[PDB]
């Protein structure tokens, strides 16, 4: 005399068995008979998927979201073998020779080029003069302020096949970040915790909470050199720029001396791009690097949909 | 690499249980 309970398992088993998608069709080429049988199944499936005459031939009842992989080749000096998987990388353009190296760049490499985090970056790169050789007109492009047009964002890396001089690199361009070797194991994206400003708390009825929170990237020419900043915000492309200008105003006040009244080519204070979108209402996670001289705290964010944007002028 | 389990049995390649196979 058991109660039998309040809910029935037969219903759940049936509806879930209905929900399972049919299996992928393996094709067996090594053995003849298995090959023939799978080909018979293939012709029956095409007869079952394309004939408007019948109704069971209608199969569309009840998404393709890997990333678009793009492969870059880079020198083994312009990249640490140890640097973590998923860090956003930014790319540079060579003039005549492009096949030799692509010269893709990492945020710590930008912090080095631009001149705690300093010591970590030096323990990664003691003699970064190749870094100066990658951009010959660095001292020219800081002033021509054309530095942002050439630094194009590439986003997180998945895999890097390791060679003596060259490095093979696979980069997520558009779509959610995902891997390839296995049934598509996921990755996450890391940015150092310092030199990152949370602009949803910098000014902190009730403000509304959107579904999706975006990460922007901006490049500023201060009198203490250029510098890069990434912003975790959620409000809108029309308001993030205004709030950012309000933020930079104390740093903008200093540029009265450097600007040139005659030549107007240096005036721009910076540019803002949008890298990708992640889940709000969650936050991010805190971890340190595990390298030899690793002391930098780093934010890492899940659920990154890489949708890169262009550099937009702000002043 | 999966420290706490039991070793049940071995698949073999090459029909020889010697160390030469994987």
């Amino acid at each position: 005399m058991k109660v039998q309970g309040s809910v029935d398992r037969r219903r759940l088993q049936r509806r879930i068995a209905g929900l399972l998608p049919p299996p992928a069709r393996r094709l067996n080429i090594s053995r003849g008979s298995e090959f023939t049988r799978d080909v018979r199944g293939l012709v029956e499936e095409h007869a079952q998927a394309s004939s408007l005459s019948a109704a069971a031939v209608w199969r569309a009842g009840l998404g393709w979201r890997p990333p678009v992989f793009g492969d870059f080749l880079i020198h083994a000096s312009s990249f640490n073998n140890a640097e973590a998987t998923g860090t956003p990388l930014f790319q540079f353009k060579q003039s005549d020779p492009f096949s030799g190296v692509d010269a893709v760049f990492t945020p710590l490499s930008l912090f080095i080029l631009m001149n705690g985090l300093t010591r970590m970056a030096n323990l990664l790169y003691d003699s970064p003069a190749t870094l100066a050789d990658l951009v010959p007109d660095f001292g020219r492009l800081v002033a021509d302020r054309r530095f942002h047009n050439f630094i194009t964002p590439v986003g997180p890396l998945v895999e890097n096949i390791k060679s003596t001089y060259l490095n093979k690199i696979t980069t997520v361009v558009h779509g959610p970040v995902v891997s390839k070797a296995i049934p598509r194991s996921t990755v996450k994206v890391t940015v150092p915790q310092e030199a990152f400003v949370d602009l949803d708390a910098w000014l902190s009825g009730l403000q509304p909470c959107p579904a999706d929170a975006r990460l922007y990237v901006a490049l500023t020419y201060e009198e203490a050199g250029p510098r890069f900043t990434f912003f975790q915000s959620s409000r809108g492309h029309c308001q993030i720029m205004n709030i950012l200008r309000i933020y930079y105003s104390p740093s903008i006040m200093h540029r009265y001396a450097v600007v040139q009244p005659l030549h107007i080519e240096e005036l721009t204070f910076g540019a803002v791009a949008c890298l990708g979108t992640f889940s709000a209402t969650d936050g991010w996670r805190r971890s340190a690097f595990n390298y030899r001289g690793s002391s930098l705290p780093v934010v890492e964010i899940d659920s990154f949909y890489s949708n890169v944007s262009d550099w937009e002028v702000i002043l | 690499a999966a420290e706490g389990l039991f070793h049940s049995f071995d698949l073999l390649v090459g029909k020889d249980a010697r160390e030469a196979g994987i």
Binding site: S30, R31 | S8, F9, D10, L11, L12, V13, G14, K15
Partner: protein
């Protein structure tokens, strides 16, 4: 060229699971025989 062609397999090899077989007739006679055999392979050819 010497002998002009090489002889090989015709289909990819598969893996056999022959690790365990002992579910039949644990007994003293076969025990002695197995010990003798697996110790005698060392010296004999």
């Amino acid at each position: 060229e010497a002998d002009n062609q090489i002889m090989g397999p015709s289909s990819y090899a598969s893996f056999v699971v022959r690790g365990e077989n002992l579910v039949t007739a644990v007994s003293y006679g076969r025990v002695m025989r197995t010990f003798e055999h697996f110790m005698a392979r060392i010296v004999d050819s």
